[PDB]
Design a protein around this ligand. Sequence first.
Ligand SMILES: OC[C@H]1O[C@H](O[C@H]2[C@H](O)[C@@H](O)[C@@H](O[C@H]3[C@H](O)[C@@H](O)[C@@H](O[C@H]4[C@H](O)[C@@H](O)[C@@H](O)O[C@@H]4CO)O[C@@H]3CO)O[C@@H]2CO)[C@H](O)[C@@H](O)[C@@H]1O
Ligand SMILES: OC[C@H]1O[C@H](O[C@H]2[C@H](O)[C@@H](O)[C@@H](O[C@H]3[C@H](O)[C@@H](O)[C@@H](O)O[C@@H]3CO)O[C@@H]2CO)[C@H](O)[C@@H](O)[C@@H]1O
Ligand SMILES: [Zn+2]
Ligand SMILES: [Zn+2]
Ligand SMILES: [Zn+2]
Length: 217
Amino acid sequence: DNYFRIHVKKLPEENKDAQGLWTWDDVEKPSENWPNGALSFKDAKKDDYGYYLDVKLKGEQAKKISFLINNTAGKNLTGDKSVEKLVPKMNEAWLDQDYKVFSYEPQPAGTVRVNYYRTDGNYDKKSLWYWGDVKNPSSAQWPDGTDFTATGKYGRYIDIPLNEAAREFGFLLLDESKGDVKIRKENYKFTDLKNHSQIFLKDDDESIYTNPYYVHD
Ligand SMILES: OC[C@H]1O[C@H](O[C@H]2[C@H](O)[C@@H](O)[C@@H](O[C@H]3[C@H](O)[C@@H](O)[C@@H](O[C@H]4[C@H](O)[C@@H](O)[C@@H](O)O[C@@H]4CO)O[C@@H]3CO)O[C@@H]2CO)[C@H](O)[C@@H](O)[C@@H]1O
Ligand SMILES: OC[C@H]1O[C@H](O[C@H]2[C@H](O)[C@@H](O)[C@@H](O[C@H]3[C@H](O)[C@@H](O)[C@@H](O)O[C@@H]3CO)O[C@@H]2CO)[C@H](O)[C@@H](O)[C@@H]1O
Ligand SMILES: [Zn+2]
Ligand SMILES: [Zn+2]
Ligand SMILES: [Zn+2]
Protein backbone atom coordinates (compact mmCIF):
# COMPACT_ATOMS: atom_id res chain seq x y z
CA ASP A 1 0.00 0.00 0.00
CA ASN A 2 2.01 2.99 -1.32
CA TYR A 3 5.68 2.09 -1.48
CA PHE A 4 8.52 3.83 -3.23
CA ARG A 5 11.29 1.74 -4.84
CA ILE A 6 14.90 2.89 -4.55
CA HIS A 7 17.31 1.10 -6.90
CA VAL A 8 21.03 1.01 -6.09
CA LYS A 9 23.61 0.36 -8.83
CA LYS A 10 26.49 -0.44 -6.45
CA LEU A 11 26.65 -0.37 -2.69
CA PRO A 12 29.52 1.87 -1.44
CA GLU A 13 31.02 -1.07 0.46
CA GLU A 14 31.52 -4.75 -0.14
CA ASN A 15 29.21 -6.47 2.34
CA LYS A 16 25.48 -5.83 1.83
CA ASP A 17 24.74 -7.14 5.34
CA ALA A 18 26.62 -4.27 6.99
CA GLN A 19 24.80 -1.55 5.00
CA GLY A 20 21.32 -0.02 5.20
CA LEU A 21 18.95 2.62 3.86
CA TRP A 22 18.25 5.48 6.28
CA THR A 23 15.23 7.54 5.25
CA TRP A 24 13.37 10.66 6.31
CA ASP A 25 10.81 13.28 5.16
CA ASP A 26 7.66 11.85 3.48
CA VAL A 27 8.20 8.18 4.50
CA GLU A 28 5.79 6.52 6.96
CA LYS A 29 8.36 5.74 9.66
CA PRO A 30 11.51 7.87 9.32
CA SER A 31 14.55 5.89 10.42
CA GLU A 32 15.51 6.07 14.10
CA ASN A 33 18.30 4.57 16.22
CA TRP A 34 21.35 5.39 14.11
CA PRO A 35 22.79 3.48 12.41
CA ASN A 36 20.97 0.17 12.94
CA GLY A 37 17.42 1.52 12.55
CA ALA A 38 18.20 1.86 8.83
CA LEU A 39 16.56 -0.58 6.40
CA SER A 40 19.17 -3.34 5.93
CA PHE A 41 20.49 -4.24 2.46
CA LYS A 42 20.86 -7.78 3.83
CA ASP A 43 17.31 -8.50 2.54
CA ALA A 44 17.55 -6.32 -0.57
CA LYS A 45 16.14 -7.82 -3.76
CA LYS A 46 18.07 -7.59 -7.02
CA ASP A 47 17.29 -6.88 -10.67
CA ASP A 48 19.25 -6.22 -13.92
CA TYR A 49 20.56 -2.95 -12.55
CA GLY A 50 21.53 -3.79 -8.95
CA TYR A 51 19.76 -3.97 -5.59
CA TYR A 52 16.46 -2.38 -4.61
CA LEU A 53 14.53 -1.63 -1.41
CA ASP A 54 10.87 -0.53 -1.10
CA VAL A 55 10.09 2.19 1.39
CA LYS A 56 6.58 2.82 2.76
CA LEU A 57 5.44 6.39 2.07
CA LYS A 58 3.85 8.87 4.53
CA GLY A 59 1.28 9.13 1.85
CA GLU A 60 -0.31 10.72 0.32
CA GLN A 61 0.40 13.48 -0.21
CA ALA A 62 3.97 12.09 0.05
CA LYS A 63 6.24 14.14 -2.20
CA LYS A 64 9.77 14.22 -0.80
CA ILE A 65 11.79 11.07 -0.05
CA SER A 66 15.18 11.70 1.54
CA PHE A 67 17.73 8.99 2.15
CA LEU A 68 21.32 7.85 2.48
CA ILE A 69 23.24 4.59 2.60
CA ASN A 70 24.98 4.02 5.94
CA ASN A 71 26.90 1.15 7.55
CA THR A 72 26.73 -0.63 10.94
CA ALA A 73 29.21 1.73 12.29
CA GLY A 74 28.68 4.22 11.56
CA LYS A 75 29.26 6.07 8.34
CA ASN A 76 27.10 8.12 6.05
CA LEU A 77 28.48 6.55 2.89
CA THR A 78 26.60 8.42 0.15
CA GLY A 79 25.86 11.84 1.62
CA ASP A 80 22.24 12.99 1.99
CA LYS A 81 20.03 12.48 -1.04
CA SER A 82 16.43 13.50 -1.76
CA VAL A 83 13.92 12.64 -4.51
CA GLU A 84 10.84 14.73 -5.18
CA LYS A 85 7.93 12.99 -6.85
CA LEU A 86 7.36 14.74 -10.18
CA VAL A 87 3.80 13.43 -10.08
CA PRO A 88 1.86 11.39 -7.49
CA LYS A 89 2.36 8.18 -9.55
CA MET A 90 6.17 8.47 -9.54
CA ASN A 91 7.13 5.36 -7.54
CA GLU A 92 10.81 4.53 -8.24
CA ALA A 93 14.19 6.23 -8.34
CA TRP A 94 17.66 4.99 -9.32
CA LEU A 95 20.99 5.66 -7.60
CA ASP A 96 23.99 5.16 -9.90
CA GLN A 97 27.62 4.37 -9.06
CA ASP A 98 28.39 8.06 -8.26
CA TYR A 99 25.17 8.32 -6.20
CA LYS A 100 23.34 10.57 -8.67
CA VAL A 101 19.56 10.23 -8.55
CA PHE A 102 17.36 9.60 -11.64
CA SER A 103 13.61 9.17 -12.23
CA TYR A 104 14.43 6.32 -14.67
CA GLU A 105 17.04 3.56 -15.01
CA PRO A 106 20.18 5.16 -16.48
CA GLN A 107 21.78 3.43 -19.46
CA PRO A 108 25.46 2.63 -20.20
CA ALA A 109 27.68 5.59 -21.15
CA GLY A 110 27.90 6.36 -24.88
CA THR A 111 24.21 5.66 -25.53
CA VAL A 112 20.98 7.60 -25.66
CA ARG A 113 17.85 5.47 -25.25
CA VAL A 114 14.94 6.97 -27.13
CA ASN A 115 11.67 5.83 -25.51
CA TYR A 116 8.45 6.10 -27.53
CA TYR A 117 4.99 5.50 -26.05
CA ARG A 118 1.73 5.30 -28.00
CA THR A 119 -1.61 5.65 -26.21
CA ASP A 120 -2.98 3.38 -28.95
CA GLY A 121 -1.27 0.67 -30.89
CA ASN A 122 1.09 0.11 -32.53
CA TYR A 123 4.28 0.26 -32.75
CA ASP A 124 4.33 -1.75 -35.99
CA LYS A 125 5.32 0.06 -38.26
CA LYS A 126 6.91 2.84 -36.16
CA SER A 127 10.50 3.95 -36.68
CA LEU A 128 13.00 6.67 -35.89
CA TRP A 129 14.90 8.68 -38.50
CA TYR A 130 17.84 10.36 -36.79
CA TRP A 131 21.00 12.38 -37.42
CA GLY A 132 23.53 14.66 -35.66
CA ASP A 133 26.29 13.48 -33.24
CA VAL A 134 25.44 9.80 -33.62
CA LYS A 135 27.69 6.92 -34.72
CA ASN A 136 25.12 5.66 -37.25
CA PRO A 137 22.89 8.40 -38.77
CA SER A 138 19.86 7.00 -40.59
CA SER A 139 21.05 5.92 -44.09
CA ALA A 140 18.67 4.85 -45.36
CA GLN A 141 16.27 5.14 -48.27
CA TRP A 142 13.43 7.30 -46.96
CA PRO A 143 11.32 6.58 -45.10
CA ASP A 144 13.05 3.82 -43.03
CA GLY A 145 13.94 4.35 -40.30
CA THR A 146 15.22 2.35 -37.31
CA ASP A 147 12.20 0.32 -36.20
CA PHE A 148 10.73 0.64 -32.70
CA THR A 149 10.85 -3.06 -31.90
CA ALA A 150 12.17 -3.46 -28.32
CA THR A 151 9.73 -3.08 -25.39
CA GLY A 152 10.68 -1.46 -22.07
CA LYS A 153 8.96 0.25 -19.12
CA TYR A 154 8.02 3.43 -21.07
CA GLY A 155 6.65 2.22 -24.39
CA ARG A 156 9.04 0.98 -27.08
CA TYR A 157 12.68 2.08 -27.36
CA ILE A 158 15.79 2.39 -29.49
CA ASP A 159 19.33 2.62 -28.11
CA ILE A 160 21.52 4.98 -30.17
CA PRO A 161 25.34 4.74 -30.27
CA LEU A 162 26.60 8.22 -29.43
CA ASN A 163 30.31 8.91 -30.24
CA GLU A 164 32.50 11.73 -28.89
CA ALA A 165 31.28 13.96 -26.12
CA ALA A 166 27.90 13.78 -27.84
CA ARG A 167 26.09 17.10 -27.53
CA GLU A 168 22.93 17.28 -29.57
CA PHE A 169 20.87 15.22 -32.00
CA GLY A 170 17.81 15.48 -34.23
CA PHE A 171 15.15 12.97 -35.23
CA LEU A 172 11.71 12.39 -36.74
CA LEU A 173 9.18 9.86 -35.46
CA LEU A 174 7.90 7.90 -38.50
CA ASP A 175 4.74 5.89 -39.27
CA GLU A 176 5.78 3.74 -42.24
CA SER A 177 2.14 2.65 -42.74
CA LYS A 178 1.41 6.04 -44.27
CA GLY A 179 1.51 8.18 -47.42
CA ASP A 180 2.77 10.84 -45.01
CA VAL A 181 5.28 9.12 -42.74
CA LYS A 182 6.31 11.95 -40.45
CA ILE A 183 3.95 11.77 -37.38
CA ARG A 184 5.25 15.32 -36.73
CA LYS A 185 6.29 17.28 -39.83
CA GLU A 186 9.02 19.36 -38.21
CA ASN A 187 12.39 18.01 -37.07
CA TYR A 188 12.78 17.27 -33.39
CA LYS A 189 16.04 18.62 -31.93
CA PHE A 190 17.56 17.64 -28.60
CA THR A 191 20.60 19.07 -26.80
CA ASP A 192 21.44 17.75 -23.28
CA LEU A 193 22.85 14.42 -24.58
CA LYS A 194 25.44 14.65 -21.77
CA ASN A 195 23.01 15.27 -18.94
CA HIS A 196 20.60 12.39 -19.58
CA SER A 197 20.94 8.94 -21.31
CA GLN A 198 17.18 8.41 -21.77
CA ILE A 199 14.58 10.66 -23.47
CA PHE A 200 10.84 10.08 -23.48
CA LEU A 201 8.43 10.68 -26.33
CA LYS A 202 4.76 9.95 -26.90
CA ASP A 203 2.07 9.98 -29.57
CA ASP A 204 2.50 13.11 -31.74
CA ASP A 205 3.57 15.24 -28.76
CA GLU A 206 5.91 18.04 -29.79
CA SER A 207 7.80 17.81 -26.46
CA ILE A 208 10.93 15.85 -25.71
CA TYR A 209 10.51 14.75 -22.13
CA THR A 210 13.40 14.05 -19.80
CA ASN A 211 11.37 11.92 -17.38
CA PRO A 212 8.97 9.00 -17.97
CA TYR A 213 6.03 11.02 -16.46
CA TYR A 214 5.87 13.40 -19.46
CA VAL A 215 6.09 16.57 -17.39
CA HIS A 216 8.16 19.55 -18.45
CA ASP A 217 11.59 20.42 -17.00
O1 LIG B 1 15.54 18.84 11.25
C1 LIG B 1 16.48 17.81 11.47
C2 LIG B 1 17.27 17.45 10.20
O2 LIG B 1 16.56 16.51 9.38
C3 LIG B 1 17.37 15.92 8.37
O3 LIG B 1 18.50 15.23 8.97
C4 LIG B 1 18.91 14.06 8.35
C5 LIG B 1 20.42 14.20 8.07
O4 LIG B 1 20.70 15.23 7.14
C6 LIG B 1 21.01 12.85 7.64
O5 LIG B 1 22.41 12.95 7.45
C7 LIG B 1 20.74 11.79 8.70
O6 LIG B 1 21.41 12.18 9.92
C8 LIG B 1 22.10 11.16 10.57
C9 LIG B 1 23.60 11.42 10.41
O7 LIG B 1 23.93 11.22 9.06
C10 LIG B 1 24.43 10.46 11.27
O8 LIG B 1 25.78 10.86 11.28
C11 LIG B 1 23.92 10.32 12.70
O9 LIG B 1 24.46 11.35 13.55
C12 LIG B 1 25.19 10.79 14.64
C13 LIG B 1 26.66 11.25 14.61
O10 LIG B 1 27.35 10.61 13.55
C14 LIG B 1 27.44 10.91 15.90
O11 LIG B 1 28.64 11.68 15.97
C15 LIG B 1 26.61 11.08 17.18
O12 LIG B 1 26.64 12.42 17.66
O13 LIG B 1 25.28 10.60 17.01
C16 LIG B 1 24.57 11.22 15.97
C17 LIG B 1 23.10 10.85 16.08
O14 LIG B 1 22.35 11.89 15.48
O15 LIG B 1 22.49 10.21 12.74
C18 LIG B 1 21.77 11.22 12.05
C19 LIG B 1 20.26 11.08 12.25
O16 LIG B 1 19.97 10.96 13.62
O17 LIG B 1 19.35 11.68 8.89
C20 LIG B 1 18.68 12.88 9.30
C21 LIG B 1 17.20 12.55 9.45
O18 LIG B 1 17.05 11.56 10.44
C22 LIG B 1 17.81 17.04 7.40
O19 LIG B 1 18.66 16.56 6.38
C23 LIG B 1 18.49 18.20 8.13
O20 LIG B 1 18.65 19.27 7.23
C24 LIG B 1 17.69 18.66 9.35
O21 LIG B 1 18.46 19.59 10.12
O1 LIG C 1 19.09 12.41 -42.84
C1 LIG C 1 19.12 13.62 -42.09
C2 LIG C 1 17.97 14.52 -42.54
O2 LIG C 1 16.73 13.85 -42.30
C3 LIG C 1 15.53 14.59 -42.50
O3 LIG C 1 15.29 14.97 -43.87
C4 LIG C 1 14.47 14.05 -44.53
C5 LIG C 1 13.22 14.81 -44.94
O4 LIG C 1 12.55 15.25 -43.77
C6 LIG C 1 12.33 13.92 -45.80
O5 LIG C 1 11.20 14.63 -46.26
C7 LIG C 1 13.13 13.38 -46.99
O6 LIG C 1 13.30 14.45 -47.96
C8 LIG C 1 13.85 14.07 -49.20
C9 LIG C 1 12.74 13.65 -50.18
O7 LIG C 1 12.33 12.34 -49.87
C10 LIG C 1 13.18 13.72 -51.66
O8 LIG C 1 12.08 13.61 -52.55
C11 LIG C 1 13.91 15.02 -51.98
O9 LIG C 1 13.00 16.12 -51.95
O10 LIG C 1 14.99 15.22 -51.08
C12 LIG C 1 14.69 15.27 -49.69
C13 LIG C 1 16.02 15.35 -48.95
O11 LIG C 1 16.00 16.40 -48.01
O12 LIG C 1 14.31 12.71 -46.55
C14 LIG C 1 15.20 13.48 -45.75
C15 LIG C 1 16.40 12.62 -45.34
O13 LIG C 1 17.13 12.19 -46.46
C16 LIG C 1 15.54 15.88 -41.69
O14 LIG C 1 14.36 16.62 -41.91
C17 LIG C 1 16.75 16.69 -42.12
O15 LIG C 1 16.77 17.93 -41.45
C18 LIG C 1 18.02 15.89 -41.82
O16 LIG C 1 19.12 16.65 -42.24
ZN1 LIG D 1 9.66 -4.92 -1.93
ZN1 LIG E 1 11.64 -0.30 -40.93
ZN1 LIG F 1 18.37 18.74 -19.15
